């Protein structure tokens, strides 16, 4: 329903595809840890 997107709309580059792996295992450490 709303128009006018931000220009940050890119298929993910392998320069930062490894960067998105470091997030999902960070919370997997903390959630499955003590808390």
């Amino acid at each position: 329903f709303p128009s006018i997107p931000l220009p940050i709309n890119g298929p993910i580059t392998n320069k930062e595809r490894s960067l998105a792996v470091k997030y999902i295992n960070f919370g997997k450490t903390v959630k499955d840890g003590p808390f």
């Binding site: 329903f1 709303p2 128009s3 006018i4 997107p5 931000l6 220009p7 940050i8 709309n9 890119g10 298929p11």
Partner: protein, 99 residues
């Protein structure tokens, strides 16, 4: 000068002129079959302030003008070669829809 369009048809000429690298700017316009009737340095400064606002040229030393190297953008700050997905995609970012 005249209120109807085709202003920018001459501003592409002055920007191709400087990209190779204000009194000299007048005499390039007089040649080259330019459809003109009256030139003056008072006008060409007002003709030059347009591309100051687009950052297609730069103002240095109160009268000199350089290219901002937007020719390399003409050919992150890289606003083409970012094509969207836009189709069957839900998690896309919009500039409106927070107001």
């Amino acid at each position: 000068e005249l209120d109807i369009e085709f202003i920018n048809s001459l501003l592409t000429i002055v920007w191709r002129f400087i990209s190779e690298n204000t009194q000299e700017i007048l005499e390039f316009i007089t040649a080259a079959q330019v459809a003109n009737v009256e030139l003056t340095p008072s006008n060409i400064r007002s003709l030059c302030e347009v591309l100051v606002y687009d950052d297609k040229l730069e103002k240095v030393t109160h009268d000199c003008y350089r290219v901002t190297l937007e020719s390399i953008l003409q050919m992150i700050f890289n606003y083409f070669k970012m094509f969207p997905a836009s189709k069957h995609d839900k998690e896309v970012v919009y500039f409106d829809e927070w107001t």
